[PDB]
Design a protein around this ligand. Structure first.
Ligand code: Z99
Ligand code: Z99
Lengths: 738, 750
């Protein structure tokens, strides 16, 4: 049983013609869609190839097509005939020269012959072999395929979820190579798309609580996970939907080719699956093949040995009257549009034959140009050269495809795989009827029709257990699932350092809404703290008042001392209010010594005519020495005022000892003057009134302490001190007017 | 050509009989050691097997032995004859039924036939293939070997370095499967033994300056890595030593099976490679094989087709061609012209291993039957390989030391046991020769005392020295640390990272050194040396003055309305105040005592002010106590806010920190005393303006200078010095100032 027809080159064909019909236990069954249909597709291509005038003109291509019986072990023994021929060793059935093998539908079959043909360097193009193992070129060195591997569906399904802002996916793989290997790619693909997996459920051919269990393992755990990424086989997908039907589940299944566009998956229980998004392989039916295939007739098809057996099984009749098994075939029986439907993967079978033909055609030009036939160099073929140099780099457009200006580009990648073109289907309800409808293609980039896709909720569903969080809600704690954390509003006035964790450098004053704000305390001014105390200015008013008093003003001794004190008192308010300028408080303390010195001079007069000048210098010297002692080591700078997370102000020196130190010098002078005023009853006693006002000012000096604690409020003491200075000066001038 | 003899179940064999002889382009010669010798071993074993009675008695083993010609591609088409046995598809040499194949030789050959025979489920035992790739049971399922893979050498060599504490090593591999696939295993093995590679050369070319610079790379990069782990091929190992000889370097090479006991590697330039350590597979020569092989005769060995070709090539004659000689009849193989091949033990073991599995299967699948029953008419490779062949445990045949580690068994991957022989190049007087100094079966066992080294001493190859006593500041030279001393008396958490908390404070090197209170501020009169004498002198002066007032009264002097007693009482109280605070400085209340001392000094000054306010005695006495209360009220108010405490005395260095008091509080206390001193200063001016009173005026004027001097001394007293030298001196200065005030007060009473 073999289609061995002669030719300059001969191609090997491996098709599952018998659905374990030669297995001797599942015997008596041949495959129609995956068998003769795909087989005759290759023969159809070969007829076109050898009659084509632009692909191998002088080279007539024969075939050596064998049956794999859908069993890897049977294929291995069969495929040896491709090897037995291309080696160095009455006799009949002279061996051929298999240039390449176009065969292997079931990946288990296509793997066990990939191992064999690799050793003897025979290229192999395999339609319909989408297993991801075959992409491992370390083992299957000489394997190419016109169909994409099954892990490209993982990429497309991941892109579909990522497109719709979807996360928290629950995946339900299936036992076997298909479900398990495919979901590994999807699990890997979800990470790179920042898609997190709620549940990693798995199913098997059990038909037990497992199916009902798997349904609730997603309804119960994370009901926020509304999208379910199926990667199950065909029969498994139906039985899971049956399980979901009984419990009346409501999900938006994002399924793989195993579900596909088959209506038999949802035959019954459609509302539970309504809104699902399933993928299917992209394939444009070959128009010419139907004309060729429908014209087949056992009375004109003698190349195919299985065709006579196919005719019997197709129509359940007998070509010979000796059987009469329920019917005898008749001459008007034929293949027509009603009893036939083109297989989904006929496009890939034709491409596989053409890809081999194109590679052989190109190698015919390079190896020996200007040679219509095949040269003696062509008489020996090398697998490594034919595979990597030409076959693994061909770029011809697909034949028999009406839409040439489309994705009809036949080309193998660096792994010999397909290009990965899919059709994003979507189960839809028209109101009383359910039917699939293509809603998007996936060549390399997804392209959907969002406004024509029915969902299960009649609105675009979202699978979220945590909404995204912003510069508001900066932190991120993860109580349950790794992906949907709970964001926490960061302690106010903070520092972002990470999305997960967020600390606080400057929780008191002036950060940014980003990773920048940390104690960003711009300095204030001389009167910056009392910007809006409510009390602006008023320092020049004391100078104006002092100027008016000076304008109003025998007893030249009082004028000499009183005039200096009035001027110094006014300057204290300006220096105190408006780092170097922070030392003006020393002058104000020295000014009070002038009043004390005058009181001491007045006390001496009441109790050395030339000693008055020396006495003033002696008193002035002490004030200067004290200022130099303190202003020398400390001072000349300003100290900040960082409160308990209130704000940051770069004020003057926070050392209150300078005020206390200054008051000490005045206190001694004031204390001495008060003692003299006690005996000043013999105008007399006017100093006592001025001396008494100093005691109140001394008490007012105490309010400065514990008064500067209020920012911009302690400055009233400086204004009060200036006011106190005016009162003492007013007492001296008040007596004179009377 | 093949030895296709019949049998109940027949084995297959692949041997490199022809050194690419069929590939006449490469070399037409045939292998003798790896070829006929190994082949005849298989035939010798089969003759032994079928003549036994406790291993396949009724099952006569046959052979179908083919020549792999030492090329894998030629082996594949040859091995197909084994494959065609199990195919269900007018004359016909009918095929046999190959239970298993005993062959593979070169790993490249064995890999290709492993792929082919894996598909058709035929077990394969390789007597010589040792590539690490064949241990991957995912690709070569039905493959077993009686020799260990090549990565066990990497495991064995790494254990030699670990045993000898060598940690910083350089490696020099070759190009190809042997050099690469092994050295990567060694590099992985180095991690588990905490070993890092100084430099990893990959000199694999035939002969270029790559080896010359490779020796330089050994010299330049890490000269402190004296031992170098070679994993490179036999011919390459020869030229590397020659390169090392030219530069006249000196290392202690740790080689592999590539450079084993082959003296041809060091033929010439023995001294440069002297002291090396070389591994080599452990194989015991088969005594019975020598009698069989030497007794072979081209007139007796008609089974072997290549024997006539072997006879001609071995003896360089011809049996009939005009060769250099006609093959004489009395030529025979003897000990002079024959040395048993190293791997003959494994060839016999491989045949016996397959025969043992088939016998054990016969005892199970066909019990109570001396022949093979109907079940064995068809054999299943999967069951035979996975159950019987992969779990055999028979002791090696023809082994002299029975019961030793010479037991044939396959591990989970169908590999050999892994026995090696650690050799060492010796200096035997004036001659260099190899000698076994160890054996790595599965744990290293070395004759560590009888091994000669290049430097005549057990060498060490390290780029770092152990900095255990000090220098817990290792810098990671890569993988070897650079130890830096930790700063004097600083904290530590890890020898790798000294985190430098408190340098100069805590004197413990055991992961400490930061602030831990290493000093005490207590100083009993400067250790009773300086300043302590002044404390006792204060009491002596008071006793004389106290008695003097009573003696003068018993009044003889001016009555003064008891003013002298009030002034004397204040003077005594002030003098005792300074001594009391110093005597108890550890207590927290000592700071309060120092603060109260200033009030006593003001009290003595206050008494002078009351005395100065003489020009109403009862009113003056009451007024005097008012000043003390005013000073006491200020002290209580200011002291109440800080309360009782004893702050520390942190220092820039030396770790001199004493919890005595607050320096700022002392300055505040000193400033607080200034307020009382200010009143005393004001009193001095009043007294100056104003017989018996003349003496008081001089004392009051003198007291003013002492107060001014004391205040000036205090600001620079103990402020710029530590509590043991300057602060203690300042404390003594304060004590001296308090005593000096008593002297001024004493002068006034006189
Ligand atoms: N292309 C298939 C894919 C096949 C498959 C397709 C859909 C669902 C389940 C499923 O089972 C597996 C498991 C592992 C690898 C491949 C598959 C191939 O055999 O490679 C096969 C349909 C092609 C055909 O036989 O016509
Ligand atoms: N067993 C060997 C080992 C061989 C080898 C041995 C020593 C040095 C280099 C080297 O090159 C490689 C590289 C990869 C794998 C195996 C080897 C085989 O060829 O398999 C071959 C000696 C055995 C024989 O045929 O006598």
């Amino acid at each position: 049983r073999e289609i061995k027809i002669e030719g300059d080159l001969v191609l090997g064909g491996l098709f599952p013609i018998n659905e374990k019909g030669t297995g001797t236990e599942e015997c008596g069954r041949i495959n129609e869609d995956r068998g003769i249909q795909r087989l005759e597709a290759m023969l159809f291509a070969i007829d076109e190839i050898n009659k084509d005038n632009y692909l191998l003109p002088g080279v007539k291509l024969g075939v050596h097509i064998l049956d794999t019986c859908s069993r890897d072990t049977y294929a291995l023994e069969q495929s040896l005939e491709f090897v037995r021929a291309s080696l160095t060793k009455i006799q009949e059935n002279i061996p051929l020269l298999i240039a390449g093998v176009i065969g292997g539908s079931y990946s288990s079959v296509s793997i066990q012959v990939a191992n064999l043909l690799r050793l003897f360097q025979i290229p192999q193009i395999s339609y319909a072999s989408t297993s991801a193992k075959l992409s491992d070129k370390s083992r299957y060195d000489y394997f190419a395929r016109t169909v994409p591997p099954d892990f490209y569906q993982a990429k497309a399904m991941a892109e579909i979820l990522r497109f719709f802002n979807w996360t928290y996916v629950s995946t339900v793989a299936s036992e076997g190579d298909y479900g398990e290997t495919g979901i590994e790619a999807f699990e890997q693909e979800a990470r790179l798309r920042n898609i997190c997996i709620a549940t990693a459920e798995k199913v098997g051919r059990s038909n037990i609580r497992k199916s009902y269990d798997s349904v609730i393992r997603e309804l119960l755990q994370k009901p926020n996970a509304r999208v379910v990424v199926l990667f199950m086989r065909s029969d498994d997908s139906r039985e899971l939907i049956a399980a979901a039907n009984r419990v009346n589940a409501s999900f938006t299944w994002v399924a793989s080719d195993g579900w596909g566009a088959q209506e038999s998956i949802v035959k019954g229980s459609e509302h539970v699956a309504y809104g699902a998004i399933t993928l299917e392989l992209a394939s444009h039916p070959v128009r010419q093949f139907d004309r060729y295939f429908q014209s087949l007739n056992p009375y004109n098809n003698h190349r195919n040995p299985w065709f006579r057996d196919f005719w019997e099984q197709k129509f359940q009749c007998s070509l010979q009257n000796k059987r009469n098994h329920r019917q005898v075939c008749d001459k008007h029986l034929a293949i027509d549009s009603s009893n036939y439907e083109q297989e989904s993967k006929i496009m890939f079978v034709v491409n596989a034959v053409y890809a081999m033909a194109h590679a052989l055609h190109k190698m015919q030009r390079t190896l020996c140009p200007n040679t219509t036939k095949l040269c003696d160099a062509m008489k020996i073929l090398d697998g490594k050269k034919l595979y990597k140099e030409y076959l693994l780099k061909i770029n011809f457009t697909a034949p028999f495809n009406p839409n040439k200006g489309a994705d009809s580009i036949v080309k193998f990648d660096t792994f010999g795989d397909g290009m990965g073109r899919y059709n994003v289907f979507n189960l839809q309800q028209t109101g009383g009827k359910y039917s699939y409808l293509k809603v998007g293609h996936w060549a390399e980039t997804l392209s959907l029709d969002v406004d024509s896709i029915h969902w299960s909720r009649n609105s675009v569903p979202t699978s979220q257990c945590s909404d995204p969080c912003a510069p508001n809600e900066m932190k991120n704690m993860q109580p349950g699932d790794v992906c949907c954390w709970i964001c926490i509003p960061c302690e106010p006035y903070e520092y972002l350092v990470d999305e997960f964790t967020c600390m606080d450098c400057g929780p008191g004053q002036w950060p940014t809404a980003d990773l920048s704000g940390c104690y960003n305390l711009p300095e204030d001014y001389i009167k910056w703290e009392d910007a809006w105390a409510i009390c602006l200015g008023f320092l020049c008013t004391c100078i104006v008042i002092t100027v008016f008093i000076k304008h109003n003003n025998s007893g030249r001794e009082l004028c000499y001392i009183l005039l200096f004190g009035v001027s110094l008192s006014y300057c204290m308010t300006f220096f105190f209010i408006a780092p170097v300028i922070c030392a003006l408080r020393r002058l104000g303390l020295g000014t009070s010594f002038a009043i004390c010195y005058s009181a001491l001079l007045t006390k001496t007069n009441c109790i050395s005519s030339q000693v008055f000048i020396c006495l003033g210098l002696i008193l002035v010297q002490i004030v200067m020495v004290s200022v130099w002692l303190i202003l020398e080591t400390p001072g000349t700078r300003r100290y900040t005022l960082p409160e308990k997370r209130e704000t940051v102000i770069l004020k003057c020196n926070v050392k209150d000892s300078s005020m206390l130190i200054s008051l000490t010098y005045d206190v001694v002078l004031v204390i001495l003057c008060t003692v003299y005023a006690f005996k000043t009853r013999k105008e007399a006693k006017f100093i006592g009134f001025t001396m008494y006002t100093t005691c109140i000012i001394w008490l007012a000096f105490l309010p400065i302490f514990y008064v500067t604690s209020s920012d911009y409020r302690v400055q009233t003491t400086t204004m009060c001190i200036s006011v106190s200075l005016s009162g003492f000066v007013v007492l001296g001038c008040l007596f004179a007017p009377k």
